[PDB]
Amino acid sequence: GKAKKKKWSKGKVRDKLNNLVLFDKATYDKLCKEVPNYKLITPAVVSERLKIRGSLARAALQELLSKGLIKLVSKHRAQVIYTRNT
Amino acid sequence: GRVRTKTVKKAARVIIEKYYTRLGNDFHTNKRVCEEIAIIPSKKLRNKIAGYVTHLMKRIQRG
Amino acid sequence: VIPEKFQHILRVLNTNIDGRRKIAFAITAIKGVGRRYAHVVLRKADIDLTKRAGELTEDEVERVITIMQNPRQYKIPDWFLNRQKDVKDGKYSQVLANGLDNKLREDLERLKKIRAHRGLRHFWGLRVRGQHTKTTGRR
Amino acid sequence: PDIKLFGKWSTDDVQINDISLQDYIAVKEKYAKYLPHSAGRYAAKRFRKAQCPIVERLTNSMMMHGRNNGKKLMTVRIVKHAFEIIHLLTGENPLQVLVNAIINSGPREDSTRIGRAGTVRRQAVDVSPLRRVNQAIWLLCTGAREAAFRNIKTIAECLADELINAAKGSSNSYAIKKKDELERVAKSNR
Amino acid sequence: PGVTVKDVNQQEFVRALAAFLKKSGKLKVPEWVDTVKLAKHKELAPYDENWFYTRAASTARHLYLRGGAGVGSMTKIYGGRQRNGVMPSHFSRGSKSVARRVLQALEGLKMVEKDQDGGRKLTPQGQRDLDRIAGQVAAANKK
Amino acid sequence: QSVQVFGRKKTATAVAHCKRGNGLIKVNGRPLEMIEPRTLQYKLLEPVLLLGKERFAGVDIRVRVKGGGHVAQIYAIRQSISKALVAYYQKYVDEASKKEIKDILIQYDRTLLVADPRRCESKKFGGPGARARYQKSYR
Amino acid sequence: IRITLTSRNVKSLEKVCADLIRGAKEKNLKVKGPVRMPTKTLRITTRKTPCGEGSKTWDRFQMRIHKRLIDLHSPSEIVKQITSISIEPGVEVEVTI
Amino acid sequence: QPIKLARVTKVLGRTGSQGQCTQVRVEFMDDTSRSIIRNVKGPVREGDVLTLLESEREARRL
Amino acid sequence: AVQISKKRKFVADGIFKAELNEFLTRELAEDGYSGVEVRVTPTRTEIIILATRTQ
RNA sequence: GAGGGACAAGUGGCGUUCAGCCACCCGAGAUUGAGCAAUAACAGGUCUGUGAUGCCCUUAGAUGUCCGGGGCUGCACGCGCGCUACACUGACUGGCUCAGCGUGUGCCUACCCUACGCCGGCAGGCGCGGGUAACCCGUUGAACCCCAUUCGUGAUGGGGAUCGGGGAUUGCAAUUAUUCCCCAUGAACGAGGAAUUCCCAGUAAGUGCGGGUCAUAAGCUUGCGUUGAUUAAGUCCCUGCCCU
Ligand SMILES: [Mg+2]
Ligand SMILES: [Mg+2]
Ligand SMILES: [Mg+2]
Ligand SMILES: [Mg+2]
Ligand SMILES: [Mg+2]
Ligand SMILES: [Mg+2]
Ligand SMILES: [Mg+2]
Ligand SMILES: [Mg+2]
Ligand SMILES: [Mg+2]
Ligand SMILES: [Mg+2]
Ligand SMILES: [Mg+2]
């Protein structure tokens, strides 16, 4: 029936924002080109800053880890800790 | 915490009035002296009476 | 590493729309496919679980829909299915999105024809297994 | 005979640059320890809470809100990640910026009521340094929690961001926001 | 030197023990576990395909630990928390069919000896197998 | 030459049999490196990481615990080692070194030699816990 | 051959134990110890009231059942010789060969 | 607009409708040994160094 | 032949004590009733009634 | 089981010789939690506790006691104690790892606790064994927690309410109430306005187990354990009570 609630707080971040499921061509190219410029390779910053999901972000970070460009410092449950040498 | 009962202070005053030369400044000796010279069923009451007896000794011997 | 495959939205059984998050969690979006049945159909279809829903062969999609429309040919015994023995046919089968609502309407229609009190409480705005209705079941 | 250290740290030359918070932060050599998960029995005496290490205090204030109420292994793990994130962000030692955050993360004087049974005025009076440390840790953990609420960022990540934006005078952290919220009322009722 | 499964870390041990059981093919899996079997009383199916080998390896470790357990004993060894939704949770046991399955499979592959006063216990052949696998896991760790 | 020193955490008891040897810590047959929480692999190492290595190489200790909780067993092992060294330095080595190593342990922490008089209180017949009560009802 | 003294009151338990050890020291029998069993306790919680007025205030009744065991290996004639003892009714005697 | 520091000499007593502040006659470190009485809410001992923001204040409540 | 537990035989004996004591204070209300003492003996079960008027 | 051990004792300050507070040490403890708890009231509740009872009604077409159904559950609504969630400090999967009270049989009138093997996916069945108990369940291999994977801010895989089909168990009988398991349908709920409840250290809270009714049987209650906070240690402003 009718809807009743004692609060009114609308206007969230972005309107059911879309996010990249699979990596694109130019987007993943930009990822691989400017990813050495970062200081802390963390999946949350890679996901939110560069319009990536967490799954594709962790997949790209493990792919670059297998490539050997970014050294893992201490991997754990939810705090993946990666750092570029020099 | 040491706001002890009138019967505790009264028993200690009876001890210090009857037997004064038997008592000193050491609690571990005054407790055994009070158990030789009196009958107290409760060990906490023994410790409390003997402690206030030591306090009365420190008060009388000083002033 | 699967750069880009031109597949976002599929059309399954004239009503359902497949998602894009996973294959085993986009088949979940079909009404009639819940939590475990999607992973069972995936294990019968032998698809890599890491792959998305938009990275999959259309022939393999037809194979998945074949497993949907007839699961009892290969495997998946009678207990795992939704539509059990009481059909008026005895057909051990899995329901479709269009078929499940039709079977529910047939259930409610024969309950109305019997005039059983379960069908009567469903015909009214009541609860069948809602044993307390003082506070429960408002508006 | 080795030096006391949290992880692979040193815990040396980390000094409080001012006074009015000395001898209440346990950063020095006489109160150093390996893990924050210590024998925390610091609630019987009135003033034995000040000898607690501030990293253990940060874990204890981090564990809140029912679903995370307890779990010292989890919150010591979060602070262990957060110190490493702070270190990987441009060096700038995490114990040192934690001391700087306790110095510059909140109150100097706060508003409260006085007697006379009259008009509610909320006059700003000076606040104890113990309560400054308490409310600073409270504002830091509250800001980290409701900054990491509903995003991909972790508790350790937003706690590290909170400590960095509170040590640096950038006014982009919730501790500095409620610091401003207190001193504007303090300047009003001064 | 002296290598023991108590000395070796477990999550390096069982992760290789599943592979060294796949190398020998020491698993029977008749029809229903060929098809699908869920967890204790839960929602989903386990993810990584070698979970039967993982159950057999955990069974082997627990029969190394406690000699004399059985079906319901190992069922309560596994156990778990059963979230019932609105109604609060309790402790639910595992399953009996996988327990008798893994016991019958390892007895047929000569790794479980029956106790005349109890149930499962370690065989000397399975003892040698687990000790040499712990030795090569510790060697791969120290290498 | 063998001294058995005991535990005494809240509901955790660690029997530590110490004897002269070549360097061993046996925790129910499982060595020092396998601490059951990964986070607390610095707090139980405090007789190792602070006191020295020749002391470890001189004294063999085996520890068996029948405790109740994880943190309780960790502190029971910690207290049992830190008391077992003190008791072995009572029974075999001189007091001139025993008092020095005991002062080091005490000035590091009191709980390394002093037990903790903390047990959980009884649940009250009025409220849900030991101090709390249920919610009232006014108008 | 063992004898179990199952008792209701611990003071009469210790009295009959002291009497039994005092009567068993002088004979040429290897008298084993009066093994202290853990005390059994039957706690019962009660509403305190026939009608429910007031706070949830509960009676908490208890018992303290004590138990001791001794081992006296002897032939049945010596067992029947030891058996005849006048005892307080708070203690019950059982034998097991 | 200076910012001064002050360590506590003596503590008079707690004050307020709740008893939440504390009349503290603190002292002046940066200047000569002058005496004002301040309200310091929260726990305080003799010797607690405290940051002041105005030195022209007043003992508030009698 | 038959046996029960120690945790139940004592409470059965106590219910027997209360049953006998309160039934004797029901029916022996005429003379002065004080209490009862029962000795557990497998040969002769002795029950001692302590009464004020023993007549 | 007995005895010891802690008494604000020792020091310094605050206080009138005082009564007593504060900091430290030695110490396990500078004191834990309960029971009992006066003089005297409420015209508080209970005759639905009785073979405790005064007065009134009935006693043969019964207001006695049985038998067979329905009912206390019934719904436009408001209120109270609670449980589950509104998630990423998280949900799922797998591995690892730790307990404490206490209960249990042929009953002074009906009855369990459960190991082992096989079958079934599961709820369960079958055969066999121990326990009237520190012996057998049981070295109560609990949950929470810890490690690895997946999920990625989407009312999403959180939430599981409602609802259909089937399969097991007690009970003589389960459908307009049992209970448990599988499949499927997948709502509100985005941290809650006015107001309001409890709480000072192994304490609140998270979390599981045991007893009570039980046959089926806890979301209640009583107790036990695991992890374990923040901030006061002050006051008469709000409320209630006491004294003069
Ligand atoms: Mg139902
Ligand atoms: Mg109603
Ligand atoms: Mg009532
Ligand atoms: Mg009274
Ligand atoms: Mg009569
Ligand atoms: Mg009537
Ligand atoms: Mg409710
Ligand atoms: Mg019955
Ligand atoms: Mg319906
Ligand atoms: Mg309920
Ligand atoms: Mg109130």
Side-chain angles (χ1 to χ4, degrees), chain H residues 12-53:
Chain H
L12 295 174
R14 294 178 65 87
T15 308
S17 66
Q18 308 309 109
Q20 59 185 357
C21 294
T22 300
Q23 289 180 357
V24 175
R25 184 179 68 188
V26 191
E27 67 102 17
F28 285 98
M29 291 190 289
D30 291 331
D31 292 331
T32 187
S33 66
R34 294 180 294 172
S35 175
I36 63 167
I37 297 169
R38 292 291 295 157
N39 284 321
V40 180
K41 68 179 184 180
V44 62
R45 291 180 293 172
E46 293 179 353
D48 291 330
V49 181
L50 181 62
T51 300
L52 293 177
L53 280 77

XYZ file of all heavy atoms in Angstrom, chain H residues 12-53:
322
model
N 41.304 23.359 43.270
C 40.362 23.759 44.310
C 39.230 22.751 44.455
O 39.059 22.147 45.520
C 39.805 25.150 44.007
C 40.819 26.293 44.031
C 40.178 27.587 43.563
C 41.409 26.454 45.422
N 38.454 22.554 43.402
C 37.338 21.634 43.460
C 36.493 21.720 42.214
O 36.606 22.647 41.409
N 35.621 20.726 42.072
C 34.780 20.622 40.892
C 33.548 21.508 41.027
O 33.060 21.778 42.127
C 34.381 19.168 40.650
C 35.572 18.291 40.292
C 35.183 16.844 40.090
N 34.300 16.671 38.944
C 34.724 16.493 37.698
N 36.023 16.468 37.436
N 33.850 16.345 36.714
N 33.051 21.962 39.879
C 32.116 23.070 39.784
C 31.145 22.771 38.648
O 31.493 22.064 37.696
C 32.886 24.391 39.539
O 33.917 24.527 40.523
C 31.994 25.621 39.649
N 29.923 23.257 38.773
C 28.967 23.195 37.685
C 27.615 22.739 38.183
O 27.438 22.371 39.342
N 26.642 22.785 37.270
C 25.350 22.169 37.541
C 25.471 20.655 37.620
O 24.681 20.002 38.310
C 24.344 22.566 36.465
O 24.709 22.016 35.213
N 26.447 20.083 36.918
C 26.748 18.667 37.009
C 27.969 18.383 37.869
O 28.225 17.217 38.187
C 26.984 18.088 35.611
C 25.875 18.398 34.642
C 24.522 18.040 35.191
O 23.731 18.921 35.508
N 24.248 16.750 35.321
N 28.717 19.413 38.253
C 30.025 19.201 38.835
C 31.056 18.792 37.812
O 31.942 17.989 38.119
N 30.966 19.330 36.597
C 31.744 18.844 35.466
C 33.006 19.648 35.188
O 33.982 19.078 34.692
C 30.864 18.804 34.211
C 30.262 20.138 33.805
C 29.314 20.008 32.633
O 29.135 18.923 32.082
N 28.698 21.119 32.246
N 33.030 20.947 35.478
C 34.269 21.694 35.360
C 35.023 21.616 36.683
O 34.559 21.020 37.655
C 33.985 23.139 34.963
S 33.274 23.320 33.318
N 36.198 22.232 36.738
C 36.993 22.236 37.961
C 37.712 23.567 38.067
O 38.480 23.924 37.170
C 38.001 21.086 37.976
O 37.308 19.835 37.884
C 38.804 21.112 39.256
N 37.465 24.297 39.155
C 38.160 25.559 39.388
C 39.622 25.272 39.691
O 39.952 24.709 40.740
C 37.508 26.336 40.526
C 36.153 26.921 40.180
C 35.539 27.684 41.335
O 36.099 27.732 42.430
N 34.379 28.282 41.098
N 40.500 25.640 38.766
C 41.922 25.346 38.865
C 42.683 26.662 38.839
O 42.600 27.414 37.861
C 42.390 24.422 37.732
C 43.880 24.242 37.802
C 41.689 23.078 37.819
N 43.409 26.940 39.916
C 44.333 28.068 39.990
C 45.663 27.576 39.438
O 46.425 26.910 40.145
C 44.454 28.550 41.431
C 45.308 29.775 41.630
C 45.328 30.171 43.098
N 46.034 29.198 43.922
C 46.058 29.225 45.250
N 45.415 30.179 45.909
N 46.728 28.301 45.921
N 45.956 27.892 38.171
C 46.846 26.994 37.444
C 48.308 27.326 37.729
O 48.915 26.665 38.577
C 46.547 27.079 35.934
C 47.254 25.978 35.164
C 45.049 27.067 35.671
N 48.885 28.293 36.983
C 49.905 29.309 37.291
C 50.368 29.827 35.930
O 49.885 29.344 34.904
C 51.077 28.830 38.167
C 52.030 27.821 37.582
C 53.314 28.460 37.120
O 53.586 29.600 37.548
O 54.070 27.813 36.371
N 51.280 30.795 35.877
C 51.820 31.274 34.607
C 53.281 30.865 34.459
O 54.124 31.251 35.277
C 51.684 32.791 34.486
C 50.288 33.254 34.206
C 49.475 33.708 35.231
C 49.790 33.238 32.912
C 48.190 34.143 34.974
C 48.504 33.668 32.644
C 47.703 34.123 33.678
N 53.584 30.114 33.397
C 54.958 29.703 33.119
C 55.721 30.729 32.291
O 56.864 31.063 32.619
C 54.986 28.355 32.394
C 54.545 27.172 33.223
S 54.884 25.617 32.383
C 53.667 25.690 31.083
N 55.109 31.230 31.213
C 55.801 32.125 30.288
C 56.067 33.502 30.884
O 56.935 34.224 30.381
C 54.992 32.271 28.998
C 54.972 30.999 28.174
O 55.951 30.226 28.251
O 53.979 30.772 27.452
N 55.353 33.876 31.936
C 55.543 35.133 32.642
C 55.969 34.826 34.077
O 56.295 33.685 34.419
C 54.268 35.978 32.593
C 53.955 36.480 31.196
O 54.903 36.678 30.408
O 52.761 36.676 30.886
N 55.974 35.858 34.917
C 56.268 35.683 36.332
C 55.132 34.929 37.028
O 54.067 34.674 36.457
C 56.500 37.035 37.005
O 56.936 36.834 38.355
C 55.220 37.859 37.007
N 55.363 34.590 38.296
C 54.444 33.741 39.056
C 53.194 34.537 39.425
O 53.025 35.023 40.547
C 55.131 33.186 40.297
O 55.445 34.223 41.208
N 52.300 34.672 38.450
C 50.991 35.269 38.651
C 49.944 34.173 38.797
O 50.201 32.996 38.536
C 50.626 36.202 37.495
C 51.502 37.429 37.384
C 51.064 38.298 36.221
N 51.280 37.638 34.937
C 50.849 38.113 33.774
N 50.176 39.254 33.731
N 51.090 37.447 32.653
N 48.747 34.577 39.214
C 47.726 33.641 39.675
C 46.362 34.024 39.116
O 45.819 35.078 39.462
C 47.691 33.609 41.202
O 46.638 32.791 41.666
N 45.811 33.169 38.254
C 44.409 33.237 37.864
C 43.785 31.874 38.135
O 44.478 30.862 38.259
C 44.205 33.637 36.389
C 44.817 32.591 35.458
C 44.785 35.015 36.114
C 44.389 32.745 34.018
N 42.459 31.858 38.223
C 41.696 30.648 38.512
C 40.856 30.314 37.288
O 40.029 31.125 36.854
C 40.818 30.818 39.760
C 41.691 31.058 40.992
C 39.934 29.599 39.957
C 40.919 31.489 42.219
N 41.063 29.123 36.735
C 40.427 28.704 35.498
C 39.538 27.490 35.728
O 39.725 26.728 36.679
C 41.474 28.381 34.426
C 42.247 29.589 33.944
C 41.325 30.487 33.156
N 40.867 29.829 31.938
C 39.752 30.150 31.292
N 38.963 31.104 31.761
N 39.409 29.503 30.191
N 38.567 27.317 34.835
C 37.711 26.139 34.820
C 38.234 25.154 33.786
O 38.262 25.458 32.589
C 36.258 26.500 34.519
C 35.558 27.124 35.699
O 35.756 26.713 36.842
N 34.714 28.105 35.430
N 38.642 23.977 34.250
C 39.187 22.929 33.399
C 38.290 21.714 33.570
O 38.361 21.024 34.595
C 40.637 22.588 33.766
C 41.175 21.499 32.857
C 41.511 23.828 33.717
N 37.439 21.451 32.584
C 36.575 20.285 32.676
C 37.341 19.031 32.272
O 38.280 19.078 31.472
C 35.324 20.453 31.814
C 35.552 20.462 30.319
C 34.228 20.602 29.596
C 34.404 20.526 28.097
N 33.101 20.655 27.391
N 36.941 17.905 32.853
C 37.668 16.671 32.690
C 38.612 16.425 33.850
O 38.720 17.238 34.774
N 39.306 15.288 33.831
C 40.230 14.971 34.926
C 41.487 15.824 34.865
O 42.044 16.068 33.794
C 40.556 13.492 34.692
C 39.448 12.982 33.846
C 39.074 14.127 32.964
N 41.941 16.265 36.035
C 43.102 17.142 36.125
C 43.817 16.868 37.447
O 43.183 16.569 38.463
C 42.677 18.623 35.949
C 41.723 19.080 37.050
C 43.884 19.552 35.844
N 45.146 16.906 37.410
C 45.996 16.758 38.585
C 46.826 18.021 38.778
O 46.731 18.978 38.009
C 46.914 15.539 38.456
C 46.205 14.206 38.514
C 47.184 13.054 38.375
N 47.784 13.001 37.045
C 48.775 12.184 36.706
N 49.281 11.347 37.602
N 49.259 12.202 35.472
N 47.658 18.009 39.815
C 48.584 19.104 40.062
C 49.840 18.893 39.225
O 50.590 17.939 39.452
C 48.932 19.191 41.545
C 47.765 19.591 42.434
C 48.144 19.654 43.903
O 49.280 19.265 44.245
O 47.303 20.093 44.717
N 50.065 19.779 38.256
C 51.197 19.672 37.357
C 50.834 19.483 35.902
O 51.740 19.345 35.072
N 49.547 19.475 35.563
C 49.116 19.270 34.185
C 49.355 20.540 33.382
O 48.740 21.577 33.646
C 47.646 18.870 34.145
C 47.407 17.491 34.713
O 48.317 16.643 34.617
O 46.312 17.254 35.260
N 50.256 20.461 32.404
C 50.523 21.593 31.530
C 49.342 21.771 30.585
O 48.841 20.799 30.007
C 51.839 21.373 30.769
C 52.153 22.544 29.866
C 52.979 21.135 31.746
N 48.879 23.011 30.437
C 47.655 23.291 29.701
C 47.843 24.493 28.788
O 48.422 25.506 29.190
C 46.497 23.545 30.669
C 45.140 23.838 30.039
C 44.689 22.655 29.213
C 44.128 24.175 31.107
N 47.340 24.375 27.561
C 47.385 25.464 26.595
C 46.285 26.473 26.903
O 45.102 26.118 26.942
C 47.227 24.919 25.177
O 48.286 23.998 24.894
C 47.259 26.050 24.165
N 46.673 27.726 27.121
C 45.733 28.824 27.290
C 45.619 29.619 25.996
O 46.574 29.724 25.223
C 46.164 29.759 28.422
C 46.147 29.225 29.852
C 46.683 30.276 30.815
C 44.749 28.807 30.245
N 44.436 30.190 25.771
C 44.195 31.018 24.601
C 43.889 32.469 24.940
O 43.870 33.306 24.030
C 43.046 30.447 23.752
C 43.352 29.276 22.805
C 43.472 27.934 23.526
C 42.319 29.190 21.693
